[PDB]
């Protein structure tokens, strides 16, 4: 029972950390795409 | 003001109140030139 | 048919002029998916034209470079696009469009 | 024992997914930094 409780706790903590990472990853992708659009526009201007 | 791990310490400009947010919560400001700008497609950075 | 959307936003539920609930307009804008739509609009390529139409519409700009003899019009389009010196990120050449 | 085995499997799979996400996060940061360096030159050129 101790091992079950420990494993579920570790799984929940890992899942929470994963969820946090996933959100930041998603925003980083959006920022990257928008910066690529900006860079293409600078190339066009030049 | 400053940053710490996954978080940022900030002061609200309307009243000077201090608060801490996640680096995922806050969004980048619209520059003065883009104030009331027309087509959303023209924005320097897409922010809700 | 080809639709043209014109989206309208509720400022408040008290039917009042000037007053605006930020959370209402925020969530309406979000569920309308405009923040995602505008991204693909700028990221992709919204204009599109068939190569023969592109040549017949703009050939005047490269009439000295484009050969008179019969061939795949996309070659003539490439020559014209090169004469205009367009950045290759601003367009994409398909087989027809 | 079934529950122990299930929890360990789920934990291992979650940890593998987390490890993969960490790699992509690292690359995204590098790409962002390099794109900022690119952008900095373009403003000066214009």
From TrEMBL, chains A, D:
It comes from the Eukaryota. It is found in: Cytoplasm, Myofibril. Belongs to the TRAFAC class myosin-kinesin ATPase superfamily. Myosin family. This is Myosin heavy chain 11. The gene is MYH11. The chain holds residues 1404 to 1449 of 1979 of the full protein.
From TrEMBL, chain B:
Belongs to the TRAFAC class myosin-kinesin ATPase superfamily. Myosin family. Coiled coil: none annotated. Signal peptide: none annotated. Residues 1-31 form the Myosin N-terminal SH3-like domain. It is found in: Cytoplasm, Myofibril. This is Myosin heavy chain 11.
